[PDB]
Amino acid sequence: DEAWKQVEQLRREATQIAYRSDDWRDLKEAWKKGADILIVDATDKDEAWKQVEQLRREGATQIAYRSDDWRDLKEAWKKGADILIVDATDKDEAWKQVEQLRREGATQIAYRSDDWRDLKEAWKKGADILIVDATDEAWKQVEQLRREGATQIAYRSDDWRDLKEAWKKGADILIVDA
């Protein structure tokens, strides 16, 4: 989880900072330290949904939850999460989760991938937040989605220099980890 500089060198930049972490209390700290989006990604669904619930009770706005299963995303949505991140690995099963969430009426579906063509298809199928996952020079994926017309492009990297370049290429959400 990031060095103290990553978060510091980004708080300078209509850009939003997303903060990802395994337990909610450092997520809550981030919420008042200025973080715009709090990503719950603990894979214990009991603990995960309880972190969503506590963040809603704490008043945190823009709670996000990440999963490969739309049913878990729908439950987190019901318990307070506003941004539902479909974690893509099997692309066809990934796009179907977006389609099902859209059928359920979700309005802030996100999609996490390393391939701009994959994100482009997810965007057409219902995903509004497209997450370029850089875990090389992936900021190039950002430039292509930018050209295709996507309005909310996010970027995740461990390194603030990469986050900055992605911002310069059109990313509006920069994803940092504790």
Which SS3 state, helix, strand or coil, does residue 23 take? Answer: coil
DSSP result, 46-98: HHHHHHHHHHHHTT--SEEEEES-HHHHHHHHHTT--EEEEE-SSHHHHHHHH
Angle formed by the axes of helices 70-78 and 45-57, to 10°? 30
Query: How far, in Å, CA of 89 to CA of 71, rounded?
Result: 17
For residues 132 and 171, the answer to whether their CB atoms sit within 8 Å is: yes
Angstrom resolution of this structure: 1.9
What would the 3-class secondary structure string for 98-114 be? HHHHHHHCCCCEEEEEC
Give CATH for domain 4-177: 3.20.20.60
Instruction: For residue 51, give Cα distances in angstroms to 41, 78, 94, 109, 120.
Output: 10, 13, 24, 19, 31
Query: How far, in Å, CA of 82 to CA of 91, rounded?
Result: 23
Which SS3 state, helix, strand or coil, does residue 116 take? Answer: helix
Domain borders along the chain are: 4-177
For residues 77 and 105, the answer to whether their CB atoms sit within 8 Å is: no
